[PDB]
Amino acid sequence: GAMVDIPLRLLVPTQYVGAIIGKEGATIRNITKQTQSKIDVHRKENAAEKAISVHSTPEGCSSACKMILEIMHKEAKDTKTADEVPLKILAHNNFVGRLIGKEGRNLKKVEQDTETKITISSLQDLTLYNPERTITVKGAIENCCRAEQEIMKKVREAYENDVAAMSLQS
């Protein structure tokens, strides 16, 4: 399909970034070629964490999310650092109402359908120019990725519903 406008944005531990890029960038270029995605790495304004942006199709983003998670787990095990590495997703505060639903029922439903635990950063931790919440997903890799697919479906729909009026008028 067409690459979509809203990227998947992950927050990963800085110490695993070198592993994701790999020698002479061959790991990231491999992920890019297998998933047909544009990937970049940058700071998140609000030290031990870095932002990863994946611009792909929905399926390309989900596949890159799984490859990235597998590398981080490989690297956490291989350095005896951790046996789990939670998946952290960045989503604009405007979209997270829809994902959460009334009294968090939509989020419990994703947690139950995917066999994951999900927690969302506090509203009070946003900044004037950083409107992104962090959604922490814990569980097996395959399960975190199913939750990624569900969350990012909801975020993309909320984005397309919010901008539909202003796209028509032009």
Residue numbers in the entry: 191 to 236, 239 to 362
Paper text:
IGF2 mRNA-binding protein 1 (IMP1) is a conserved RNA-binding protein that plays a key role in regulating cell motility, morphology and differentiation in the embryo, reviewed by Yisraeli. At the molecular level, IMP1 regulates the transport, translation and stability of a diverse ensemble of messenger RNAs (mRNAs). IMP1 contains six putative RNA-binding domains—two RNA-recognition motifs (RRMs) and four K-homology (KH) domains —which are conserved across species and found in pairs (RRM1RRM2, KH1KH2 and KH3KH4) that are closely spaced in the protein sequence. IMP1 function relies on the recognition of a diverse set of mRNA targets that is mediated by the combinatorial action of multiple RNA-binding domains.
In order to understand if and how the KH1 and KH2 domains also fold into a pseudo-dimer structure, we expressed an IMP1 construct that includes both domains (residues V194-N369) and determined the crystal structure. The structure shows that the KH1 and KH2 domains fold into an intra-molecular pseudo-dimer,, an arrangement found in a number of KH and RRM-containing proteins including the IMP1 KH3KH4 di-domain. Within the pseudo-dimer, the domains make contact through the two β1 strands, the inter-domain linker and the C-terminal α-helix of each domain (α3), burying a surface of ∼1200 Å2. Interestingly, many of the amino acids mediating the contacts between the two α3 helices (S254, C257, H265) are conserved in KH1KH2 across species but are very different in KH3KH4. In addition, KH1 α3 is longer than KH3 α3 and the linker between KH1 and KH2 is three amino acids shorter than that between KH3 and KH4, implying that the shorter KH1KH2 linker must span a longer distance to reach the amino-terminus of the second KH domain. In KH1KH2, after a sharp downward turn, the linker assumes a nearly linear conformation retracing the direction of the helix to reach the amino-terminal residue of KH2. The differences in the inter-domain interface result in a change in the angle between the two domains and, as a consequence, in a shorter distance (7–8Å) between the two RNA-binding grooves, as highlighted by the superimposition of the two structures. The structure also shows that the path between the RNA-binding grooves of KH1 and KH2 is positively charged, which may impact on the dynamics of RNA looping as discussed in our model below. In addition, the α3 of KH2 is extended by three turns. A plot of the RDCs measured in solution against those back-calculated from the structure reveals the high correlation (R2 = 0.97) between the two datasets, indicating that the crystal structure is highly representative of the protein conformation in solution.
